[PDB]
């Protein structure tokens, strides 16, 4: 017996390819960022990211 409820940042990107998002990074400009903005519970339509 070896139960488990949560691991460590499983995320749904373990199937994704680092090459795919790569092209998307250059397309948007994720590899040319000078100032990384802050990410804190801002909007109200995305409050689902609480996880509290």
């Amino acid at each position: 017996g070896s139960g488990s409820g949560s691991g460590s940042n499983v995320i749904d990107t373990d199937f994704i390819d680092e090459e795919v998002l790569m092209s998307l990074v250059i397309e948007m400009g994720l590899d040319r960022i000078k100032e990384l903005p802050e990410l804190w519970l801002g909007q109200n339509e995305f409050d689902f990211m609480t996880d509290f």
């Binding site: 940042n9 990107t13 390819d17 903005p37 519970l41 801002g42 909007q43 990211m49």
Partner: protein, 101 residues
């Protein structure tokens, strides 16, 4: 240090998706080195910051209570992306599709 932005802006949600990508890449990008014992040169140097976060998240014992740089965000963000499923969620779903563009 400076304070005055704990709730961030609404555009952050937009940056969340984009950031997730930097945190998404940085994720598999940070595990590709520790899982092989060695490290390799990365294309986009932006993943560096995340590498310091994902690594900090390991030293981050509060996670959702931490406020180190992006810690709470990297934890809060990856959190959504982790618990999020179905519904009108254009974050993990589309990023999981990758059908076109």
């Amino acid at each position: 240090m400076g304070s005055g932005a704990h709730t961030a802006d609404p555009e952050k949600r937009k940056l969340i998706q984009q950031q997730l990508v930097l945190l998404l890449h940085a994720h598999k990008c940070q595990r590709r080195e520790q899982a092989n014992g060695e490290v390799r040169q990365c294309n986009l140097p932006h993943c560096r910051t995340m590498k310091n976060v994902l690594n900090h998240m390991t030293h981050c014992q509060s996670g959702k209570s931490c406020q180190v740089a992006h810690c709470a965000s990297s934890r809060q963000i990856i959190s959504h992306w982790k618990n999020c499923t179905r519904h009108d969620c254009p974050v993990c779903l589309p990023l999981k599709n990758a059908g076109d563009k």
